[PDB]
Amino acid sequence: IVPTRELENVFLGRCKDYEITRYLDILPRVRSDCSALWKDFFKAFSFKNPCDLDLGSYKDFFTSAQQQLPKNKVMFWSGVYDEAHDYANTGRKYITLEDTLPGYMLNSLVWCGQRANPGFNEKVCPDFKTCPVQARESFWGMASSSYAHSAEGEVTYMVDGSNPKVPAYRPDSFFGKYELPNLTNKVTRVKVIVLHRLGEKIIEKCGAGSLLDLEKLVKAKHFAFDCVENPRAVLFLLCSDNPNARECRLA
Amino acid sequence: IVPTRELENVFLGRCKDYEITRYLDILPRVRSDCSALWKDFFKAFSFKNPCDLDLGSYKDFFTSAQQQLPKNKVMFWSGVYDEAHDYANTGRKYITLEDTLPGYMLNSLVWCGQRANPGFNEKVCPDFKTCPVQARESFWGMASSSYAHSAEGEVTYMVDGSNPKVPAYRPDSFFGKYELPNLTNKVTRVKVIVLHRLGEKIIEKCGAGSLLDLEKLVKAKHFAFDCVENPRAVLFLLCSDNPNARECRLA
Ligand SMILES: Nc1ncnc2c1ncn2[C@@H]1O[C@H](COP(=O)(O)OP(=O)(O)OC[C@H]2OC[C@H](F)[C@@H]2O)[C@@H](O)[C@H]1O
Ligand SMILES: Nc1ncnc2c1ncn2[C@@H]1O[C@H](COP(=O)(O)OP(=O)(O)OC[C@H]2OC[C@H](F)[C@@H]2O)[C@@H](O)[C@H]1O
């Protein structure tokens, strides 16, 4: 598994591009400059083994890179990357973690530390499914925590209700692991959206299975709660890509 | 009207980002590296009056930055930015000019030359509707040329059929000015999509008004031709944002 080339340069460019042109009316600017940000990013992991990370290792970075988030516009998701991001619409409808400075810079990149100069490895990185969990999930876990923690108002969660193997809510998804338990008293409610892929067997439903569990969980947190399956706005997205599925017929 | 801060740095960062992470399986990489590209970009307009540009001013730069384009996947649009780009889905379904390197680096930026050091203006740029047409359209017109020119196979064109003021096809839209007339013999056909916004009065149709004109024009070019109005795929898109409009009712 191959590390991202010229990591430092890509990091600093994405960062500059963002600072100056992206989500301008949508997210506030961060306060550290780019080489400030990088410094902290690099320190987290450099000069150690790949597997020598825990959940505190990028604490400082996410401290500098955190942005306050628009009221009611935070979204979360599980097993629906494409559809959740299509529906969120680059910040226009909702904010996803991928829209925030740190999510945007780091999205899709592969890196790791090595003890020998230059402190990081340009040939290879280990699966990470070979590392302890706290390493494996050092970065994106802390990312999700910082994210979830700075959410205010209403939040929305999109899930996949068409999976026999993976339930809609699972307490060891990133959502259940780092996102849900980190929400603060500033959050008032959790709107849930259950995606039911077209053509494919329906598995989870509001008020049953895991979603019954999540419901209870959320209520305990002193949050409101609602849940809907394939609301029209979402339904049409799906259909857009599959306009013949039996679910898409016109009046 | 305010020029983009730190132009150079944004350009170079957007450029590195693309070079290394964007459209990897969709567009080929460019050959010039980034400060090569920037040199040609800068040369084109620096140390001259904003108003001192013609159509050849960024010829070199688009020579360097041009990429060969997927067969049949090239799209054009007029007056439907949002909808066309949604439908194109970041290159997955079609390629828009905005997905190419040059389009991507420069998208949305504001800059202009000045004669006194440092060559360009960091306070203000005149409202280009004060310049001769060839200046006003120096950059994006050339950009559309080089793009249109590099198209092969089938091409698609999306138009707005719901506008009393602006007809669906106009010979002075960038499409009719730089794109259409620059299509080469490698192109075989033009698929046209007429958007009919929901709730709003229908104006143009296939085989009438400017679309009759465009049709004939396209036939003279020895290209095939078809045209549809709100195909389902597109229809659901619109509907996604406006799920109550009469047009959107379910069986
Ligand atoms: N740091 C990360 N952030 C987002 N996605 C990630 C991250 N790391 C890996 N992934 C992908 O997510 C899958 C892991 O499970 P999943 O995506 O099916 O659902 P989870 O609740 O587990 O994570 C997504 C939530 O956490 C934060 C977001 F804002 C969502 O609300 C893997 O296959 C990866 O493609
Ligand atoms: N949201 C936006 N973001 C950035 N620029 C925009 C936006 N909306 C309009 N514009 C600009 O407003 C001017 C008038 O656009 P038009 O829509 O009248 O169609 P044209 O055929 O003249 O030009 C679009 C075609 O040319 C090159 C492509 F391949 C299309 O097939 C355009 O140059 C747009 O860049």
HEC string for A149-203: HCCCEEEEEEEECCCCCCCCCCCCCHHHHHHHHHCCCCEEEEEEEEECCCCCCCC
List Cα–Cα distances, A48 to A120, A141, B247, in angstroms.
8, 19, 60
Q: Are A176 and A170 in contact (CB under 8 A)?
A: yes
Q: Give chain B positions within 8 Å (CB) of A29.
A: none
Residues B89, B190: one domain?
yes
Nearest CA of chain B to the CA of A193: how many Å?
15
Separation of CA B76 and ligand 2 centre (Å): 9
Residue A138 and residue A14 share a domain: yes
Q: Give ∠ CA A89-A91-A93 in degrees, rounded to 5.
A: 60
Q: Is A29 exposed, middle or buried (0-12, 13-18, 19+ CB in 10 A)?
A: exposed
Phi, psi dihedral angles at B134 (to 5 degrees): -60, -35
* A167 shares its domain with A209: yes
Size of interface A-B (CB pairs under 8 A): 78
Q: What is the CATH number of the domain that holds B109?
A: 1.20.82.10
Q: Is A191 exposed, middle or buried (0-12, 13-18, 19+ CB in 10 A)?
A: middle
Solved by what technique? X-ray
State whether A189 and A245 are in the same domain: yes
Q: Which chain A residues touch B4 with a CB distance below 8 Å?
A: 20-21
Going through chain B in order, the beta strands assigned E by DSSP cover 74-78, 153-160, 187-195, 224-229
Kindly state whether residues B107 and B182 are assigned to the same domain: no
Dist. CA A87–CA A96, nearest whole Å: 10
Ligand 1, atom 8: closest residue by C-alpha: A140
Contact A152, A69 (CB under 8 A): yes
Contact A217, A180 (CB under 8 A): yes
Task: Indicate yes or no: CB of B4 within 8 angstroms of CB of A20.
Answer: yes
Resolution (A): 3.0
Q: Which residues line ligand 1 (CB under 6 A)?
A: A 76-79, 96-97, 140, 143-144, 173-175, 179
Residue A83, token pair as written in the block: 């559809």
Helix or strand holding residue B116 (H, E): none
Q: Residue A80 in 3-state DSSP?
A: coil
* Inter-residue contact A32 to A11 (CB < 8 Å): no
**Sign of the four-CA dihedral A131, A108, B86, B29:** negative
E strand map for chain A: 74-77, 153-160, 187-195, 226-229
Give dist(CA B187, CA B165) in Å, integer: 31
Instruction: Report the distance separating Cα B111 and Cα B121, nearest Å.
Output: 7
Question: For residue A144, which atom of ligand 1 is closest to its CA?
Answer: 27
Q: Which two tokens stand for residue A5?
A: 């080339």
Q: Looking at the structure, tell me whether residues A3 and A24 fall in a common domain.
A: yes
Ligand 2 centroid to residue B106 C-alpha, Å: 14
B209 with B104, same domain: the answer is no
**CATH for B216:** 3.40.50.720
Nearest CA to B241 out of A226, A80, A92 is that of: A92
Buried b (16+ CB within 10 A) or exposed e, B149-161: bbbbebbbbbbbb
Residue ranges lining ligand 2, Cβ < 6 Å: B 76-79, 81, 97, 140, 144, 173-175, 179
B138 plus B158 within the same structural domain: no
CB contact under 8 A, B233 and A251: no
> Which residues of B are known catalytic residues?
98, 174, 179
Query: Cα dihedral angle (A180, A181, A187, A189), rounded to 10 degrees?
Result: 50
Measured between beta carbons, the chain B residues lying within 8 angstroms of A236 are 236-237, 239-240, 243, 248
Q: How many CB atoms lie under 10 A from the CB of residue B240?
A: 22
**CB–CB contact A236 B250 (8 Å):** no
**Pair (B89, B115) in one structural domain:** no
* Residues A42/A132, Cβ–Cβ less than 8 Å: no
Which residue range forms the structural domain that includes residue B22?
1-67+100-151
- Tell me whether residues B109 and A240 touch, CB distance under 8 A: no
Residues B146, B178 within the same domain? no
Q: Element (H or E) spanning B146, and its range? A: helix B138-150
Cβ–Cβ contact A243 with B under 8 A? yes
Q: Are residues A234 and A118 in the same domain?
A: no
- Cβ–Cβ of B239/A241 closer than 8 Å? no
Counting ligands in written order, the one closest to the CA of A143 is 1
Cβ atoms of B101 and B15 within 8 Å: the answer is yes
**Interatomic CA distance for residues B19 and B16, integer angstroms:** 5
Burial of B60 (0-12, 13-18, 19+ CB in 10 A): middle
CB pair distance less than 8 Å for B236 and A249: no
CA separation for the pair A81, A79 (Å, rounded): 6
Closest CA to A149 of A76, A86, A87: A76
Q: Residue type for A107, please? A: N
How far out from the chain centre does Cα A64 lie?
18
Q: How far apart (Å, rounded) are the C-alpha atoms in residues A113 and A131?
A: 13
A112, A138 contact by CB (below 8 A): no
Q: Which residue of A has its CA nearest to B249?
A: A251
Query: Number of structural domains, chain A?
Result: 2
B204 plus B157 within the same structural domain: yes
Structure tokens at B14: 């957007």
The pair of structure tokens assigned to B125 is 């740029």
Among residues A91, A123, A151, which one ends one of the domains? Answer: A151
Cα(B51) to ligand 2 centroid in Å equals 21
Query: What is the longest distance spanned by two Cα atoms in chain A?
Result: 66
Residue B5 φ/ψ region, left for φ over 0, alpha for ψ in the -120 to 50 degree band, beta for the rest: beta
Closest chain A residue by Cα to residue B244: A232
Q: By the 8 A CB rule, do A16 and B10 touch?
A: yes
CA dist A75 and A156 (Å) reads 5
Which residue among B87, B120, B151 closes a domain? B151
Q: Which atom of ligand 1 is nearest to the CA of A166?
A: 18
Q: Which strands make up the sheet holding B153-160, listed edge to edge?
A: B74-78, B153-160, B187-195, B224-229
Instruction: Name residues 52-91 of chain A within 8 A of B (Cβ).
Output: none
> Two tokens at A110?
């592969």
CA quadruple A141, A142, A147, A153: dihedral positive or negative?
positive
Domain end call among B91, B121, B151: B151
Closest by alpha carbon to A95, among A182, A155, A143?
A: A155
